[PDB]
């Protein structure tokens, strides 16, 4: 409902539908080319993209807000992982902002990177190429795994016919244990 200046939303949050749609399309294309649509649900990524677009359309009066505030104002149930997805996208923006000279001199952060999102969308191809020349994976595996797929020891032996028989004596129940089991659930 951000496109109409209904009394339930202040006039400062109103925006044009075409510009917001184009910005969100560019952001979701950036997410697609940066491995953010594979595996994860699309809707949280779409919400993060449209939130970043709405913030970049007016960071003067919209950077102070949050994703929960935006979802409450838009009367739309926010996805739970979306914020996390948002963070990842923000990280991507940082990995782009370090390539541009003026942005890498500005020394932006996770909050001040949205205001230049349009610039990041202007030359996104070279930015993502430089970022990938230095891929995207879940953070669980990006902890520098030194042991990848450890090889188990070859223990396919089975003895001659029987390795031992005390295992059966250990697995069977004693008469006292049987009586205790019968008394427990009598």
């Amino acid at each position: 409902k951000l496109f109409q200046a209904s009394p339930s939303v202040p006039a400062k949050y109103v925006e044009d539908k075409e510009k917001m749609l184009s910005r969100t399309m560019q952001l979701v294309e950036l997410a697609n080319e940066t491995w953010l649509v594979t595996g994860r649900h699309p809707l949280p990524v779409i919400t993060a993209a449209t939130f970043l677009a709405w913030q970049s359309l007016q960071p003067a009066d919209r950077l102070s807000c949050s994703l929960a505030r935006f979802c409450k104002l838009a009367n739309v149930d926010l996805p739970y992982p979306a914020s996390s997805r948002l963070q990842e996208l923000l990280a991507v923006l940082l990995r782009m902002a370090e390539q541009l000279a003026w942005l890498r001199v500005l020394r932006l952060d996770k909050r001040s990177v949205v205001k230049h999102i349009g610039d990041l969308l202007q030359h996104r191809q070279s930015l993502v190429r430089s970022a990938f020349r230095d891929l995207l994976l879940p953070p669980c595996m990006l902890k520098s795994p030194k042991r990848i797929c450890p090889v188990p020891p070859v223990s396919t032996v089975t003895g001659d016919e029987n390795i031992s028989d005390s295992e059966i004596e250990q697995y069977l129940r004693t008469p006292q244990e049987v009586r205790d089991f019968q008394r427990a659930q009598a």
């Binding site: 809707l43 949280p44 009367n75 739309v76 149930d77 926010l78 244990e177 205790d180 089991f181 427990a184």
Partner: protein, 111 residues
């Protein structure tokens, strides 16, 4: 006809709904002494999930099953160590230990 029994609630305004597709089953967490008493109950009774669930009023059967599977996957050495040692079935002292664990968790909730 009821008189002022229900309050109006706004829900599902028929817009694009997020596809949750997740049922996060609520599982009560495991404490240190709770893990120790679960291990001693396993060592005393074996791998009988029903008997363990009966003597665990604060837990569930599926929770005990998930914990046993996680233990067999992660600390198989401690699992075998507990299975090697045996201890006779205790009932009165077991209830006393249950009351002690109740008092301990009550003190923990008071903190």
């Amino acid at each position: 006809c009821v008189v002022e029994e229900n309050d109006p609630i706004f829900e599902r305004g028929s817009t694009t709904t997020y596809s949750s597709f997740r049922k996060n089953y609520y599982s009560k967490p495991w404490s240190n002494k709770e893990t120790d008493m679960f291990f001693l109950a396993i060592s005393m009774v074996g791998t009988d999930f029903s008997m363990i669930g009966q003597l665990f009023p604060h837990r569930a059967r599926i929770e005990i099953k998930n914990k046993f599977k996680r233990e067999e996957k992660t600390n198989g050495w401690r699992i075998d160590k507990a299975f090697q040692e045996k201890r006779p079935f205790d009932f009165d002292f077991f209830a006393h230990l249950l009351q002690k664990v109740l008092a301990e968790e009550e003190k923990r909730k008071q903190k």
